[PDB]
Design a protein around this ligand. Structure first.
Ligand SMILES: COc1ccc(C)cc1NC(=O)CN
Ligand SMILES: COc1ccc(C)cc1NC(=O)CN
Length: 435
């Protein structure tokens, strides 16, 4: 695996021990061979689980998620996928790692796709080796892979709204259920319905995942209601998954705005990872997977692959060369390579809008490429009437940094800035000049 110009897909089935058994063996061999190695975790939660898997091995944990005192001598780094891509974009020296290991390498967030494109390009150049660890590589067509224990798979109508009758199987269950919903707002409705029926519910989404995931260990629960973020190595002591088989797809319309289309079917990879939360214990056969729809390749034309091109166009590789997406996921976007390359100062603005600004990549790019500086929020108010953001059926309003009350009406409308109460609160703070 560890030889230059090799990219290995470690595609053992979910729960086969890729992280707890195989990874430490790879790391030991890498240190022996004096390979400068990076290990990429999808989330802080997985970063902390990896520290447990790798304990006593000399690894530099480049995250506050791990409380360890480093020796200073480590040649293995561990960081999150997004941290890798972030450091590549910034004017910070990132070592040219001899061995690049990506755990949960199916993750479809723009920074993960970009990281795979950069890494696979270095491997193609003959510069490096890589290992992509996932049960579900890009373009997998298998929603029902092998498991540690037999799974009961049932196609059934799954509620996506509060219900009064017709779904007794949902609440009659005495075990623990992980329920994949397509959005935070949809999870809120299902969660309230379950709570009203006497169930103990924990809700997980990207912004809340580290804090709320700990509740799955510290409190008794009946249901976890989660978005797709629990596809990325989240482990539960559960005996049932309920899968809507639905997701939201961010779509760029007429190069001009981003909508959250759907809900629509998940990919086969997503479905397999959702199901893969259960069947993990060879001593507990007959975990249940209840699924409410079919799969489709909804990653085609999904904004995250164009956003990944925006990131890669702005990462130095060698002279004017630009890293390609990882070949198996490269046709998910129609882009001209280099079309999003920004000059140094617009690039710094683009980076700051994504990090400090917490804006979606697409929206950060529209603002930075327009020659707007990071602190200039006039664009949050001067859009068309149809760009008016609504909050409880009234136009959303903020006090501008000038002290003027204005309707939020961004020049570029990205539905991700107002997809739920938390998102809109963050965007209101941004529009007001508060970060
Ligand atoms: C929302 O945060 C980001 C936005 C954009 C990029 C490329 C990375 C990050 N996150 C990190 O760098 C976390 N350490
Ligand atoms: C020669 O190109 C390839 C052939 C096959 C595979 C798996 C990857 C690449 N290259 C890339 O994916 C560059 N990002």
């Amino acid at each position: 695996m560890l030889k230059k110009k090799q990219l290995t897909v470690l595609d053992l089935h979910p729960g086969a021990g890729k992280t707890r058994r195989v990874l430490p063996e790879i790391v030991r061999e890498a240190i022996k061979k004096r390979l400068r190695t990076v290990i990429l975790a999808p989330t802080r939660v997985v970063a902390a689980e990896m520290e447990e898997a790798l304990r006593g091995l000399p690894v530099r944990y480049m995250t506050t998620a791990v409380n360890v005192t480093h020796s200073g001598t480590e040649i293995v780094d561990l960081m999150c996928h997004a941290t890798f891509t972030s450091r590549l974009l910034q004017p910070i020296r990132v070592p040219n790692y001899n061995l690049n290991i990506m755990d949960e390498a199916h993750f479809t967030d723009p920074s993960s796709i970009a990281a795979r494109g950069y890494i696979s390009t270095r491997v193609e150049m003959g510069e490096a080796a890589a290992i992509f660890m996932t049960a579900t590589p890009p373009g997998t067509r298998d929603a029902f892979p092998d498991s540690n224990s037999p799974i009961m798979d049932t196609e059934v109508e799954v509620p996506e709204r509060a219900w009064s009758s017709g779904f007794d199987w949902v609440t009659d269950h005495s075990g623990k259920t992980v329920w994949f919903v397509p959005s935070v707002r949809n999870g809120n409705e299902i969660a309230a319905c379950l709570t009203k029926a006497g169930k103990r519910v924990i809700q997980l989404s990207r912004k809340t995942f580290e804090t709320e995931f700990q509740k799955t260990k510290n409190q008794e629960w009946d249901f976890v209601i989660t978005t797709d973020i629990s596809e990325m190595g989240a482990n539960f002591k559960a005996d049932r998954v309920i899968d809507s088989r639905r997701c939201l797809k961010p779509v760029i319309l007429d190069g001009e705005r981003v909508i959250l289309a759907g809900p629509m079917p998940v990919t086969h990879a997503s479905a397999a990872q959702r199901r893969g939360r259960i069947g993990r214990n060879p001593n507990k056969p007959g975990d249940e997977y209840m699924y409410g729809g079919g799969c489709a390749e909804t990653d085609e034309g999904h904004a995250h692959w164009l956003e990944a091109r925006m990131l890669l166009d702005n990462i130095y590789l060698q002279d004017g060369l630009i890293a390609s997406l990882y070949r198996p996921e490269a046709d998910k976007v129609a882009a001209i390579e280099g079309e999003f390359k920004l000059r140094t100062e617009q690039r710094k603005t683009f980076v700051e809008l994504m990090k400090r600004g917490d804006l979606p990549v697409w929206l950060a790019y529209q603002v930075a490429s327009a020659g707007i500086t990071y602190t200039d929020r006039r664009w949050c108010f001067d859009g068309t009437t149809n760009n008016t953001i609504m909050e409880d059926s009234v136009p959303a309003e903020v006090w501008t940094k000038y002290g003027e009350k204005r309707v939020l009406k961004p020049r570029w409308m990205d539905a991700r800035v107002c997809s739920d109460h938390a998102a809109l609160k963050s965007f209101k703070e941004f529009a007001a000049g508060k970060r």
